[PDB]
Amino acid sequence: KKNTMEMYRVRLSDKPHTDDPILCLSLSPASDPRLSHTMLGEILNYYTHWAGSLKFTFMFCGSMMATGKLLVSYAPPGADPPKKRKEAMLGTHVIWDIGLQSSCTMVVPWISNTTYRLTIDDSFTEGGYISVFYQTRIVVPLSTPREMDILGFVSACNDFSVRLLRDTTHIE
Amino acid sequence: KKNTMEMYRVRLSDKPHTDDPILCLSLSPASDPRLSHTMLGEILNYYTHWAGSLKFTFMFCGSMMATGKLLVSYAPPGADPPKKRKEAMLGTHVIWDIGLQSSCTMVVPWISNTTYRLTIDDSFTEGGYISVFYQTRIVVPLSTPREMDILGFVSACNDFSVRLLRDTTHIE
Amino acid sequence: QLTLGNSTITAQANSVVAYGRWPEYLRPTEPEVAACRFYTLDTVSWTKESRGWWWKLPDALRDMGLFGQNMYYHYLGRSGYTVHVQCNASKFHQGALGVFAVPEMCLAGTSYQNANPGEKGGTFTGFCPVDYLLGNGTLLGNAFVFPHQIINLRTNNCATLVLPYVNSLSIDSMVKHNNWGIAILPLAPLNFASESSPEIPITLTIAPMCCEFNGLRNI
Amino acid sequence: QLTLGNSTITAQANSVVAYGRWPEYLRPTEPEVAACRFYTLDTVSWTKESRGWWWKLPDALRDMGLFGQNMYYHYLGRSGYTVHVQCNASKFHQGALGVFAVPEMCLAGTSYQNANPGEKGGTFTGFCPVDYLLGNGTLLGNAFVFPHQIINLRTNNCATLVLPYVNSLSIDSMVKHNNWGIAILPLAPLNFASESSPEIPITLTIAPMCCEFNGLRNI
Amino acid sequence: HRSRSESSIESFFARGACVTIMTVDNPASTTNKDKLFAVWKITYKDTVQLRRKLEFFTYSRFDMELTFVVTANFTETNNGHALNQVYQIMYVPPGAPVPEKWDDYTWQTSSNPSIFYTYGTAPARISVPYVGISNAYSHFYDGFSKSLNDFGILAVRVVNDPNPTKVTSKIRVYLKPKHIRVWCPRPPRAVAYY
Amino acid sequence: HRSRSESSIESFFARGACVTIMTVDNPASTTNKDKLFAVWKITYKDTVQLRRKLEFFTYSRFDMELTFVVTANFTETNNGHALNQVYQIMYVPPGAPVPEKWDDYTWQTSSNPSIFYTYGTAPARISVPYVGISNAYSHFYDGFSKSLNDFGILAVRVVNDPNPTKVTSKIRVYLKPKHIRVWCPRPPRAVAYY
């Protein structure tokens, strides 16, 4: 799927639903391979220190008739990636009723001891996670297709900031 | 005729009049061979950028008895040199009745996308044309000579300007 | 020097407003300078043998750019004119022209290709309309009832006719009906001193006034 | 129902004014209704295999009557736009389009016949610009920097972009330089319930705003 | 309390970086080969870093701040004690004739500014203002003839007369775009495309 | 909005351009030939560019801003390590005696200003004021004796004593007319006439 337009969208099928995340995403931009190309990994790959709050918008590209619920959970830094629906529900979550809403927004807050967290440090791998869980299987009428798509958008918030340009763009 | 005083004047005979311009003149000073020696081609051969409106005065060195009409047409830049009287008449023209006037003045306006058009660029060859057409053959009484003369004068207007001295005057 | 848009003719015999009525807007569109130019038709060389020349309006201006593409791509159209004839001659040429603005000029010696020549105009004869009767079966002497002017080459050399819109219908299709007609006839034949130029040009200059077109035909 | 001259489209997803700047007159001419129509280009049938469609402005409107005959018979020309995409789909169709107004859209996979298709538009590919990189060598994900909109077929089916005149020169020749570029890309492929119509149309509707042309070329 | 005034356009771009290494040499008295005057057309499309940083945007207006670091070396064991080289560094503005010989008039022409540099002193320095016909540089052009903005040329030679030493020299050029404005952001190109 | 303040007289003329290359040399201790003091009469009628630009007008009042670029080279393989040459650059005003020897009194005379230049430092520089009898230079004179305005002379030599090295030198002179006024415009001469 890489190198094509199939990489950007996650398929929400209607079969196993084995109580495991649809998608778990690390909240360390400029270090996460799947989050270091989104114009935050392209600006934080020129800097060394970053300090701000991100913003994840999940859009549901399905039919108006499709109904159900999803669970967007945010494990703060120093925690572990929740691996079951109940644990994610016990944390900081938002229930996203796709039936009556089409996009769910989650603003990851800026929590850290320092005023600026190093962008690419392999020691700090507990920067927090954002995960999506099947609260309820999807219900669709008639022959409406089972397979659906969900898209993610990652943006900086109005209080973002970076420091100490690096400019590691070599060629050889 | 070159290298002499015969170059500066154009003869308006009274024979073929084959609906083709008496004289067609490109409006790109400092690049046109017949317009790059008139003290505008001598000042714009020291500069690189020019931006202004020119001014062409055509004087008719004939007898008071000679009567007729001429047609001074201005094809704006991006057009093509009009090659018949009707097409020139459909454009931006002035009818010059030599009988009751002896000099016709035409101020080519400054039209261009940029604020300054390069002086000598061989890519831009559609800078506009000014042409003279026989609106009506010349009528003279008695044995008045058929051959006559017309002189042209090219001057800058009060809003002319140049930029970026070049000074290409070599010797070797 | 006139001020109508792109075209300007140097004109120094005063205007003869036909029927005492100035062309006025119907009480549509307003072309402003789109068609109200001075369309200087081609010149015709008056000689010692020429018998006349007849143009028809608006058929004459059927290829004159914006006016031609507005009268042909509309359905209803009305417009006066300011026909202006100039005969550039020296002091040693003698003659006289009559310019007649013949409304509903039916030159019945009639195919549409013969009675609507266009910019070329035409030529009377002694399609060969008879000059003697003006082509209308009526003696030329009476032709002076038509709103006219005389260009005598010892007092003037230009004649201006301000033709209003004269038609039974307040607005008519310009591609089928020719409201007016300009007939130029030599009243006194041209003559000149020896060795002078033997053919003096005549230039018409039509300036549609208060033109209004209604309808449209795409393209 | 809009009010722009002859053409009116019935439009019930709000307008996304690109860069927060409304198209404004240069501080020329004023075509008014001469070219400020709603030129509804031909529809393109979105299917389960289509990868994208790219149009370029003003090259798209090179045959649209008065605008096409004004941008080609002038020398300088500037104009914003009000591109308007509508994807008529029922409740049982699912998908999502991204409409990107790509300034200086250089789809370098370049002959002038390949980068200026016109009303036909074009088609990305997986002349075959690569959809994955948007044809610009850059990942499609970042493409959202361009002033864009998203047409998700469960919340809306129309998207309006108000493109101002963006060009290094305050006024440029419309026949050589393509200021903008409209790229429509399926973010989520079309899908539908069985036996439903398998190809939903998409109609663009370009409305030149504040157009100004300077110069002229006769004819 | 944070600032955000380090992601500004000028802060992001106003960083000097070598753009070329122009090689010249003082011809030996044997005249084996004439002066190797080095001519280089000012263009940012040879440095990956500056080009990539400039391709985030469509149009830009940046003033250049060229600077020259001059180094030289004898190619032979014998010293020869060549007196300190004097380098002429001529900035041929956009459109002016391009030098084609080490004795062409363009070196002596009045229009082209020039700097004279004695090997050893502080590095030379000029500041080419915003020199362009349009109202902003363009890195992506969607039009056709009938990008490639011309900034000028730099031509460097050794004024000194031939000396039997073969003193080779390599002028490093550092370009720091200052007073830079940028419009119309675009997706960043991958680092493999250059 | 345009300026027009680039076609001004000073902007058109106030451009430095080499006017001569005066050759001197430090005599060898063998005294094969005495010092080649270089004497050059200041005249603009040897540079095509400046002369042509000045022939657009009849009368002019321009102050000179001479500048000297000094270069040198050993003529022999052996270095000899000649200590940095010291050049005396004497501006002989108009009418003063013209030096005829490398030891003439004119070098030591009080009237003639002189500059002492150690090979290596920043280029020398003077500014000859408007030095003329009349109230404006004249490039075209319609009279007869009973043009050729005298600006002065420049005489350059090497103060150092003879050393067995044969250190040849070539002083390039750059003239930038400043505070220049011009009257009575004339047709420009063709570029083949010079």
Residue numbers in the entry:
A (entry chain C), B (entry chain C): 61 to 232
C (entry chain B), D (entry chain B): 84 to 95, 98 to 112, 122 to 203, 212 to 228, 243 to 335
E (entry chain A), F (entry chain A): 69 to 214, 233 to 280
Excerpt from the publication:
PV, an enterovirus within the Picornaviridae family, is a positive-sense single-stranded RNA virus with a 7500 nucleotides genome enclosed within a non-enveloped icosahedral protein capsid of ~30 nm diameter. Virus-like particles (VLPs) that lack a viral genome represent a safer potential vaccine, although they require particle stabilization.
The rsVLPs were found in the D Ag conformation in all serotypes and expression systems, except for PV1-SC6b produced via MVA in mammalian cells. Only a C Ag particle could be reconstructed from PV1-SC6b expressed via MVA and few D Ag particles were observed in the data. In contrast, the same rsVLPs from yeast assembled significant numbers of D particles (1320 picked particles were D and 2428 were C antigenic form, a ratio of 1:1.8). In the case of the expanded C Ag structures observed for PV1-SC6b produced in yeast and mammalian cells, the VP1 pocket was in a collapsed state compared to that of D Ag particles; filled by sidechain residues Ile-157, Tyr-159 and Phe-237 of VP1 and consequently empty of any observable cryoEM density indicating bound lipid.
